[PDB]
Amino acid sequence: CPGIEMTWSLQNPVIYKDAYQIKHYQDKAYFDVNGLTPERDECEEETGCEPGDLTKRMACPWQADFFNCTIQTVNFSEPSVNKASQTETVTSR
């Protein structure tokens, strides 16, 4: 959520050519001529990974993901709620 080094793209088997082996999208020549594809999702198109696809989902800069990798205060009464709006009224005499 996302995690530290990588995220849930590493869970999709569409990224692999075999167990532990990443699928490689296009060749050096294709990149020398056209560069990288920015909008492309290696999960949508099952044709492999382009350089930078395994880390692109992580925070920019990474210190955000490290900053939030601490502790969460989780709701455990309402299955579909994590966070809500709270309203505190203090009336004194």
Next chain:
Amino acid sequence: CPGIEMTWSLQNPVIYKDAYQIKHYQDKAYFDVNGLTPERDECEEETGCEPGDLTKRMACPWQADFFNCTIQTVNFSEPSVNKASQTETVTSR
């Protein structure tokens, strides 16, 4: 209230021999033989002053009358009341 240098015993004419001049109780040859009377009031006795009578009514030590010599947040609604008891009760929901 009592003051800085002297107190209200200086408004009593009974300690004066004549104007501006203080009345002297006994003489030199009394304090060498008997010592000084601590109990004696110069305003009540009417018979003159002993060494110490003029500043004895002041704070022990003096820095008290000086520390208190600042300001006063004086009540102006009730002539017989200077200080009273206050109760602040705070009820909050």
